[PDB]
Design a protein around this ligand. Sequence first.
Ligand SMILES: *[C@@H]1O[C@H](CO[C@@H]2O[C@@H](C)[C@@H](O)[C@@H](O)[C@@H]2O)[C@@H](O[C@@H]2O[C@H](CO)[C@@H](O[C@@H]3O[C@H](CO)[C@@H](O)[C@H](O)[C@@H]3O)[C@H](O)[C@H]2NC(C)=O)[C@H](O)[C@H]1NC(C)=O
Ligand SMILES: O=C(NCC(=O)N1[C@@H](c2cccc(O)c2)CC[C@H]1C(=O)O)[C@@H](S)Cc1ccc(O)cc1
Ligand SMILES: O=C(NCC(=O)N1[C@@H](c2cccc(O)c2)CC[C@H]1C(=O)O)[C@@H](S)Cc1ccc(O)cc1
Ligand SMILES: *[C@@H]1O[C@H](CO)[C@@H](O[C@@H]2O[C@H](CO)[C@@H](O)[C@H](O)[C@H]2NC(C)=O)[C@H](O)[C@H]1NC(C)=O
Ligand SMILES: *[C@@H]1O[C@H](CO)[C@@H](O[C@@H]2O[C@H](CO)[C@@H](O)[C@H](O)[C@H]2NC(C)=O)[C@H](O)[C@H]1NC(C)=O
Ligand SMILES: *[C@@H]1O[C@H](CO[C@@H]2O[C@@H](C)[C@@H](O)[C@@H](O)[C@@H]2O)[C@@H](O)[C@H](O)[C@H]1NC(C)=O
Ligand SMILES: *[C@@H]1O[C@H](CO)[C@@H](O)[C@H](O)[C@H]1NC(C)=O
Ligand SMILES: *[C@@H]1O[C@H](CO)[C@@H](O)[C@H](O)[C@H]1NC(C)=O
Ligand SMILES: [Cl-]
Ligand SMILES: [Cl-]
Ligand SMILES: [Mg+2]
Ligand SMILES: [Mg+2]
Ligand SMILES: [Zn+2]
Ligand SMILES: [Zn+2]
Lengths: 607, 604
Amino acid sequence: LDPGLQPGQFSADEAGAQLFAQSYQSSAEQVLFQSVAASWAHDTNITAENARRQEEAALLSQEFAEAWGQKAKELYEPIWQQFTDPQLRRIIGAVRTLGSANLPLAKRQQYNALLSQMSRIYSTAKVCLATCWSLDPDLTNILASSRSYAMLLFAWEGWHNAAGIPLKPLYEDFTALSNEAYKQDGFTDTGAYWRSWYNSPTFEDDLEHLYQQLEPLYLNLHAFVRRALHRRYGDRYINLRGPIPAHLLGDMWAQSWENIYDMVVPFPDKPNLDVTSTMLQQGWQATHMFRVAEEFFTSLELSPMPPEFWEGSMLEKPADGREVVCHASAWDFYNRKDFRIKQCTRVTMDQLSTVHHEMGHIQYYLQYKDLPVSLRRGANPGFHEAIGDVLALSVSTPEHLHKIGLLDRVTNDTESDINYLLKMALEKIAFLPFGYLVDQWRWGVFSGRTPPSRYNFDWWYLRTKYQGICPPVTRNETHFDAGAKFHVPNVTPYIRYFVSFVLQFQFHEALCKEAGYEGPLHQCDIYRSTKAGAKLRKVLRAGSSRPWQEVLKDMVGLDALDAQPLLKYFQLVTQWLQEQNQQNGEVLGWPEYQWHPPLPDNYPEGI
Amino acid sequence: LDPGLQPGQFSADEAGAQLFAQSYQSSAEQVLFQSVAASWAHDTNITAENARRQEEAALLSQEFAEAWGQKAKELYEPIWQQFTDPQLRRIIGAVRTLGSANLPLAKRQQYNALLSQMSRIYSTAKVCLPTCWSLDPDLTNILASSRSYAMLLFAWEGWHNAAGIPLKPLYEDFTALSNEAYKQDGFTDTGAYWRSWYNSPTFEDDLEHLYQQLEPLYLNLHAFVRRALHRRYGDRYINLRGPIPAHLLGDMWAQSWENIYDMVVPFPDKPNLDVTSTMLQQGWQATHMFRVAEEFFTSLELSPMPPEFWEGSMLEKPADGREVVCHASAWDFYNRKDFRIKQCTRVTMDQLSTVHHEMGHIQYYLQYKDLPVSLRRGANPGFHEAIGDVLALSVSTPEHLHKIGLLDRVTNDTESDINYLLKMALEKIAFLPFGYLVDQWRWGVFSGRTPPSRYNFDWWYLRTKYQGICPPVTRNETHFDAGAKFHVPNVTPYIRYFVSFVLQFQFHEALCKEAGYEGPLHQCDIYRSTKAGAKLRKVLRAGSSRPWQEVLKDMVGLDALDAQPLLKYFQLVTQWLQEQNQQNGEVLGWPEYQWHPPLPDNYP
Ligand SMILES: *[C@@H]1O[C@H](CO[C@@H]2O[C@@H](C)[C@@H](O)[C@@H](O)[C@@H]2O)[C@@H](O[C@@H]2O[C@H](CO)[C@@H](O[C@@H]3O[C@H](CO)[C@@H](O)[C@H](O)[C@@H]3O)[C@H](O)[C@H]2NC(C)=O)[C@H](O)[C@H]1NC(C)=O
Ligand SMILES: O=C(NCC(=O)N1[C@@H](c2cccc(O)c2)CC[C@H]1C(=O)O)[C@@H](S)Cc1ccc(O)cc1
Ligand SMILES: O=C(NCC(=O)N1[C@@H](c2cccc(O)c2)CC[C@H]1C(=O)O)[C@@H](S)Cc1ccc(O)cc1
Ligand SMILES: *[C@@H]1O[C@H](CO)[C@@H](O[C@@H]2O[C@H](CO)[C@@H](O)[C@H](O)[C@H]2NC(C)=O)[C@H](O)[C@H]1NC(C)=O
Ligand SMILES: *[C@@H]1O[C@H](CO)[C@@H](O[C@@H]2O[C@H](CO)[C@@H](O)[C@H](O)[C@H]2NC(C)=O)[C@H](O)[C@H]1NC(C)=O
Ligand SMILES: *[C@@H]1O[C@H](CO[C@@H]2O[C@@H](C)[C@@H](O)[C@@H](O)[C@@H]2O)[C@@H](O)[C@H](O)[C@H]1NC(C)=O
Ligand SMILES: *[C@@H]1O[C@H](CO)[C@@H](O)[C@H](O)[C@H]1NC(C)=O
Ligand SMILES: *[C@@H]1O[C@H](CO)[C@@H](O)[C@H](O)[C@H]1NC(C)=O
Ligand SMILES: [Cl-]
Ligand SMILES: [Cl-]
Ligand SMILES: [Mg+2]
Ligand SMILES: [Mg+2]
Ligand SMILES: [Zn+2]
Ligand SMILES: [Zn+2]
């Protein structure tokens, strides 16, 4: 560790802890920058050399965390919990948790190399027929636009096999090292550490109670969609009393169903709410999508994207043959100047929403860039994930799409409302079981309830239990289907997205009220509301300086996650789907839980 | 409720609570008897009228528990936790727990009535062909001795459909009413009350730690047995890397595997350690089996069965066209006089072990009959289930079988040691996953984690997770396969049996040491050891007066459940099974977790 980065001496008291944090800040920024920079160089340009540099930067960060971490524990171990400065205790608590820096050097290197290798495997995996398809864009477009049961099966099986199988031995080793590291910080396992970020003793119970309120909406959406799939694929491939085959919902993970809207839209005579075709016809490109997102932010009197963002960001998949991490992400370099998005942007309506989601991260970074580095995070991780989604809820309204030239015809009638709320349900309600189950799986792995011998057995138990889907080909424990989802090998927690999908409707309700809007919640558009902007800004500028329950109370008037705003938003389609399913004699659920579809005749040769 | 059973006036202090407890347990003695008496009349003669009277008795019991529980909180609710007397603290907290008495009257009627109907459905269900077969003895005998895949399937599917499907709507109603009752006592759900019996903050974690030490033994036994089934039935019906079809292990629930011993016995040249054929050749009957078990108890200077036991017990299935609950059980009438067994006894070796198990209960009853009622229980429920099994461990040794004329003396060689420990593994190790998982299922139902919409989904998840078996025909949520196991509709907790199967080896080691034995633990016979009997008598007389942790430490030197004795008992066959599986290149476990066998051609 360079001497400029090493901790000096401080009194064993709060006024030294305060200078401890200021000195830490000075050094942490440099260490965070070199770490983020090395990660950027690798993720935009996957090479063995760039992985080596990233691993050395990770080792430097561990060295730093150990020195300041053990200094913080040498002096302030019994006094940091009683400091009068609230932000200072949050700063100290972060610095003192060592994580992977608890591992001996040899195990730190093993851990860093596992992360790099898992990232390379996921983001360079390919499905081959000579020619070979990548996940983004090749397989993504197949899952989204093909309606050939056999072609979709080929992409689904090929992807899950290519990505999952080689990751499994690495993921087992990572899990053991991660647990070893956080056990030295006092946590029973890594999942307990991840859950502690929400500072709620009843977190898991709170989430289950939320999901109990939301599940009836999912069950009815599921039964309605299953019926539409049955009319296209037939009784051989769709069981009206069984799980839906996991490759038929428009998405590799069946996590968002927006791409099958054309098959489920109840009133096709109304305006076409999937504006992808109009974007193509009009010649939209990636940079236009980002400029339109930015202008919504500035319409609220939030910050534009700085020059450093436009000069440094990767907004399209490189055409020079480089391998890149294509999963969309937003980057804070912790120098208060450099902020970037990395996205292999495609010209579609759902990608326009993803652009807003990522730019919402950037807006957060810009608003809290002047806080201490330890407080440059969301009030909780679900806050960070919800910011851009909240704006995108306004952007997706038919009225707003008309304003930006993507929907010529504009209607206000009950059929058009049902169409729109059904499309939004395919995006927001269909995701809820998946956003809930992923970390239930990983929590069980981290705790040891799910050993390697049950990785896939327990994954598919949860997939069927919550999503009501089944794998379209047989799987066994050689397969590692959880590994075929970006966040698992890239070790990004997932429960934040279930929290986000609830929270964003709480935010939307509050911002719409602040904007003076007095119509139906799902027709609200906060575009150009500077009052809504100022309320959102107060949240963003707080970072993690205050408990999220208090930040939420100031914003929405409640100190807890609450499903009622989401339920209110969807109320009309919730009632309509329930009526439709009853009239059609649907079975809610999948009581034939053991059913799987047969294989296509002449599979996989027809491909 | 009779005035003489309603509670009197008592001071609000520990001295008054001492008189309170005495007056409670003198009046409880009379109420319990009339409940047990009416249950007995029903289970040995299932009719609507005996159901009516058993329910009248249950309502009266709930009236009694109400009156005395409400008085107990009225007087002592804020002070009893501070009594110096630990036994009195035990009694009062119990009396303060009302259970189904917390229900309003109309719900009490409904709850009492669901129990009667679930019991009738399970014990009268039949499988009819294309004559009708009953579970005991007909289907039991088919599962134990048929080696026809299709016949075993017909019996397995027939039974699970006939019992499970009609029970499901009733079990849902029962679950809801049971949870409503015990929430009023402060339990999050009925499962939490059941678990509270073990007075351990870390019960579930401790069980999981026990199972982690036992699972390698089960996995090796499983893979060895799967290989033997593959040879018999073929690659069509057995997947060497997948779960075993659930009907092929000699038992309707695949819960113990001793009945396929003759298919997996490695050294069939050696003496047949299944002495069933000798029992029949010699003319054994139910009454002989009970007299032989009795004499083991008295050989230890424990009590004989009293005249009331022999006159009142039902030791054979009645042949007078009558319907009975055939599941074996042992009855305490809480009058210090009447103790009985109800068993549809068959002349087989595993039934001789079941006879000892049931007589274990009776011996317990006899040794604590003078205690005040609230203590007339095992230190915990697993203690009660373990007593007879411990003696049966001695009875099953080839040396003891030789003493009682059921085995021509065998040689103390290695092939006979392996043969024996394998047969015992089929009976004891194979049970461990099942004993563990049944109440995992039931706890999730009570907690709400498992709604009716996932009863069968979650049952088969657990059956595959723990036992590594699969249903031999497709199942869906119309089926209620948990309902096809006696203890579910008859609402008898199951974790006691996992506890018992670990505890009995701790008891066995303690008693063998106390007897002076010094050979291998699995060759010990405590027959006629009056010192062993004396140390066991102490446990039985303690009832539930002292915490089971203290009773246990007095007997075995340790205050907690421990798998080491079980591991020591089986050590030699654990090593041998490991070697056999490596030689055959077995995969341990069932990584093809999705696999199910195909149907037989033109079945049924
Ligand atoms: C689409 O249309 C709906 C429905 O409009 C209402 O019903 C129609 C059948 C006609 O009768 C319309 O004249 C009628 O407004 C619109 O929702 C409605 O918006 C208005 C605001 O413009 C709401 O009125 C307000 O209501 C509150 C009480 O909550 C008062 O405090 C306000 O002063 C004001 O009167 C009205 O409640 C609301 N109706 C419903 C059912 O939500 C909607 O605005 C419109 N959308 C677009 C994009 O044009
Ligand atoms: O979350 C991230 N993008 C979005 C995203 O992935 N999702 C969320 C979504 C997707 C699209 C539109 C939305 O309105 C929201 C929900 C689903 C979930 C999903 O797609 O699975 C990056 S910012 C997080 C990261 C990535 C790499 C890292 O190394 C570190 C962090
Ligand atoms: O346990 C009881 N018999 C034995 C028994 O069932 N088993 C235990 C066993 C079976 C055979 C031999 C043994 O060494 C032990 C373990 C499995 C388990 C099983 O067979 O599933 C009555 S005492 C239980 C009851 C009956 C009716 C009631 O109303 C209340 C309780
Ligand atoms: C991707 O990373 C590689 C390194 O892995 C870069 O290759 C270097 O390119 C520079 C040019 O600036 C050369 O001087 C070095 O010799 C190269 N190093 C190696 C090891 O080949 C490459 O430039 C990067 N690509 C992009 C577009 O940034
Ligand atoms: C069967 O033989 C074994 C040894 O082959 C006997 O075990 C020995 O028992 C004596 C005491 O009787 C001990 O001193 C030895 O240490 C034991 N040896 C082993 C290897 O355990 C066993 O007692 C014999 N049992 C019978 C019933 O004959
Ligand atoms: C449940 O199962 C019943 C019994 O048949 C089983 O399911 C059918 C579909 C076949 O696969 C058969 O081999 C199985 O044994 C069916 O009658 C019933 O329709 C099934 N579905 C429901 C909702 O109960
Ligand atoms: C798992 O499935 C694959 C392909 O279906 C197969 O090659 C493999 O043998 C199966 N079993 C195991 C144990 O891997
Ligand atoms: C069985 O019960 C019925 C009605 O309860 C009664 O009439 C009959 O005598 C009983 N049979 C025996 C054998 O006790
Ligand atoms: Cl998170
Ligand atoms: Cl129990
Ligand atoms: Mg799309
Ligand atoms: Mg048996
Ligand atoms: Zn994000
Ligand atoms: Zn018993």
